[PDB]
Amino acid sequence: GSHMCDAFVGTWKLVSSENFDDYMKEVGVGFATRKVAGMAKPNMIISVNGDVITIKSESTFKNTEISFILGQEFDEVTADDRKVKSTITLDGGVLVHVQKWDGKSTTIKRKREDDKLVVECVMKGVTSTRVYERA
Ligand SMILES: O=C(Nc1ccc(Cl)cc1C(F)(F)F)NC1(C(=O)O)CCCC1
Predict the structure, then answer these.
(1) Whose CA is nearest to atom 8 of ligand 1?
(2) Which of 6, 71, 80, 110 has most Cβ atoms within 10 angstroms of its Cβ?
(3) Ligand 1 pocket by C-beta < 6 Å: which residues?
(4) φ/ψ of residue 108, rounded to 5
C-alpha cells in the first residue's frame, strides 16, 4: 500500500529559481559552468522500486541519476562534477540529502508544498530555492 515517499513520485519540471547562482558560487562552481547551468530548465523524475528510490535530473546541461536506500550512504557525482558522499533520509515527510566532500557539506531538502515540489539548497550562509511542478 502507501508509503511516505509516494507524494514525491512523478515527473517534475522546474518553474522557478531563486539565488541559484550564489549557491553554485558557494559550492565552488566556475563562471562558465554557472552561466550554462543557470539557463537549464531541468526535469526531475522520481520513482520507487521496493526500498530503492531513483531520482533522475535531466536537462540540456547534463543528465544525472541517483539510486539509493534511505539512510545508506552512497557515492554521487554531482552535475558540476564534485565526487561527494551522499546520504538521503526522510525527516517526517521531507527528503533530506546531505553531500560531503573535501571537508565541506551541503544540504538539499525536497518537500511537498501545495502542488509543488520545493527544493531548498544550503551551503554555509547561502540558500537557494528551486520550485518544480508536475510535468
Ligand atoms: O543538479 C542539480 N543542480 C545543479 C545544476 C547544475 C550545476 Cl553546475 C550544479 C548543480 C548543483 F550544485 F545543485 F549540484 N539539481 C537541483 C536542481 O534544481 O537543478 C539542485 C539540487 C537538487 C535539484
Answers:
(1) 80
(2) 110
(3) 24, 27, 29, 33, 37, 42, 57, 61, 64, 78-80, 108, 119, 121, 130
(4) -115, 120
